[PDB]
Every structure is written in structure tokens, then in C-alpha cells.
Design a protein around this motif. Sequence first.
Motif, PDB file in Angstrom:
ATOM      1  N   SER A  93       0.848  -1.187   0.000  1.00  0.00           N
ATOM      2  CA  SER A  93       0.000   0.000   0.000  1.00  0.00           C
ATOM      3  C   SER A  93       0.883   1.235   0.000  1.00  0.00           C
ATOM      4  CB  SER A  93      -0.873   0.002   1.261  1.00  0.00           C
ATOM      5  OG  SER A  93      -1.620   1.204   1.413  1.00  0.00           O
ATOM      6  N   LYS A  94       0.327   2.353  -0.487  1.00  0.00           N
ATOM      7  CA  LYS A  94       0.942   3.661  -0.283  1.00  0.00           C
ATOM      8  C   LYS A  94       0.135   4.547   0.660  1.00  0.00           C
ATOM      9  CE  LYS A  94      -0.603   6.157  -4.470  1.00  0.00           C
ATOM     10  NZ  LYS A  94      -1.066   7.355  -3.717  1.00  0.00           N
ATOM     11  N   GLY A  95      -0.768   3.962   1.440  1.00  0.00           N
ATOM     12  CA  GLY A  95      -1.418   4.680   2.523  1.00  0.00           C
ATOM     13  C   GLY A  95      -2.827   5.112   2.189  1.00  0.00           C
ATOM     14  N   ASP A  96      -3.012   5.581   0.957  1.00  0.00           N
ATOM     15  CA  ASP A  96      -4.311   6.007   0.451  1.00  0.00           C
ATOM     16  C   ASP A  96      -4.763   5.158  -0.727  1.00  0.00           C
ATOM     17  OD1 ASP A  96      -2.486   6.918  -1.449  1.00  0.00           O
ATOM     18  OD2 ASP A  96      -3.264   8.962  -1.514  1.00  0.00           O
ATOM     19  N   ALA A  97      -4.031   4.095  -1.044  1.00  0.00           N
ATOM     20  CA  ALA A  97      -4.372   3.248  -2.168  1.00  0.00           C
ATOM     21  C   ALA A  97      -3.577   1.961  -2.055  1.00  0.00           C
ATOM     22  CB  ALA A  97      -4.044   3.921  -3.505  1.00  0.00           C
ATOM     23  N   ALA A  98      -4.129   0.904  -2.640  1.00  0.00           N
ATOM     24  CA  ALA A  98      -3.379  -0.329  -2.787  1.00  0.00           C
ATOM     25  C   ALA A  98      -2.279  -0.139  -3.828  1.00  0.00           C
ATOM     26  CB  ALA A  98      -4.301  -1.448  -3.252  1.00  0.00           C
ATOM     27  N   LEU A  99      -1.208  -0.913  -3.685  1.00  0.00           N
ATOM     28  CA  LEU A  99      -0.249  -1.130  -4.758  1.00  0.00           C
ATOM     29  C   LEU A  99      -0.562  -2.476  -5.400  1.00  0.00           C
ATOM     30  CD1 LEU A  99       3.072   0.063  -3.085  1.00  0.00           C
ATOM     31  CD2 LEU A  99       1.461   1.339  -4.528  1.00  0.00           C
ATOM     32  N   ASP A 100      -0.754  -2.494  -6.727  1.00  0.00           N
ATOM     33  CA  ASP A 100      -1.153  -3.723  -7.408  1.00  0.00           C
ATOM     34  C   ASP A 100      -2.439  -4.196  -6.735  1.00  0.00           C
ATOM     35  OD1 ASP A 100      -0.988  -6.702  -8.265  1.00  0.00           O
ATOM     36  OD2 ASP A 100       0.697  -5.848  -9.369  1.00  0.00           O
ATOM     37  N   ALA A 101      -2.560  -5.495  -6.476  1.00  0.00           N
ATOM     38  CA  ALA A 101      -3.778  -6.015  -5.865  1.00  0.00           C
ATOM     39  C   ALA A 101      -3.911  -5.651  -4.391  1.00  0.00           C
ATOM     40  CB  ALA A 101      -3.821  -7.537  -6.017  1.00  0.00           C
ATOM     41  N   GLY A 102      -2.837  -5.221  -3.737  1.00  0.00           N
ATOM     42  CA  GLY A 102      -2.897  -4.794  -2.357  1.00  0.00           C
ATOM     43  C   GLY A 102      -2.655  -5.878  -1.323  1.00  0.00           C
ATOM     44  N   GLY A 103      -2.932  -7.134  -1.645  1.00  0.00           N
ATOM     45  CA  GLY A 103      -2.670  -8.196  -0.701  1.00  0.00           C
ATOM     46  C   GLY A 103      -2.949  -9.538  -1.312  1.00  0.00           C
TER      47      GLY A 103
END
Length: 207
Positions: free
Chosen positions: A18-28
Motif C-alpha cells: 500500500s501507499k497509505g491512500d491506495a493499494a499497490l497492485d492487488a494490495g494483498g
Amino acid sequence: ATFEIVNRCSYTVWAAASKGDAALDAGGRQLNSGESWTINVEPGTKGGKIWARTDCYFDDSGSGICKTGDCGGLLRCKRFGRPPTTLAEFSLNQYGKDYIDISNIKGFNVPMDFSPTTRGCRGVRCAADIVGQCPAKLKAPGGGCNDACTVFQTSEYCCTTGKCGPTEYSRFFKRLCPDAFSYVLDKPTTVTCPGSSNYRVTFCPTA
């Protein structure tokens, strides 16, 4: 940039990005022991973090709970996770350079190595048995070793005024993992890499 996330632990983890306000890629995603997950992180991403979550239960909608690192009950994290969480932290393509570090500022749950897979810089690691050695007052019942700001909520541990020093608690994390941030104003252990490098995060790099 490509990040390969590898679970070398003997137990399942649920990786998060994550970047705090959004997932990175699928997020998990769930990573059983030995599994690898490759994600793509957009160039220029500032303030990204990758971490592991332990002892999670999720329904078919992707909603549930984890004992460390839970990000609002979601499998696919959009926000950062609840301590204790060992953190891989990165800011990419910042005036031609990438910056990476590992941080114990939000505690420790799983050992980690964070290394480039391309040329031109070194990796960082925190692989000591911090949970086993954790001071009694910082032990988290669900697992892990909390940082002192999370536990005690003082200006000194949280560095709220921008002035704070090392503490008995921060020195514990620093003694076991010198190459990770132990408090907000620690002497930086950030590594500078060429812009647009690629990386691998390995959970339980020795175990």
C-alpha cells in the motif's frame, strides 16, 4: 518497477502492499510457505510499504481479520496495517534515485530481507529473533513485538515535537537489527539505488 515478494517462512503469511491512500497492485494476497507473488509498482511511487500479516481469516468477499498488520479487515489492503509490522519502505524515481529501507518504528512481526534484483546498490535485512527476545511490556498478545510509541503514546516515544532521543526500547530494536530504523529520528539506514531498480522482499530470509 517489479517487486517479487517471497514467503520463506514455515507458516502462511498474507502479504500487503500500500501507499497509505491506495493499494499497490492487488494490495494483498495469501502466500503459503515457499510461494512468490510478483507485483508491479508504478514509477514515481512515494511512500510505499510492504509488510506481512499473520494469523488471518478471510471470507469469500475478502473481509476478515489478522492478528498482526490488519488493514481495516481487508485482504486487499488500501491503507497501512496495524502494528506490530516489520516494514519494507520505498520511494521510487525521486530525482533519478530510488530509496529503500526497513523500519521497526511500527514494531516487528516477521523477519525480512529487502534487496534489489538489479545492479547498483545493496540490500538490507532484519532477521533476528525480535519476538523471542521482546521486552515484556512490548509483547503483543496476538504475536509480535510492538514499538514503544504504539504501547505508551508519549511525546518522547512518538517523537511528536520533532525532538526526541533514543530510548531503552528503541535501543533494543537497534541492537538486534542495526540496519533498520528503530525510532523516528534514528540515524538513517536508507539505501540509495538507481532509479527504476527492481526488488525482492523475502519473509524469513534465514528461517
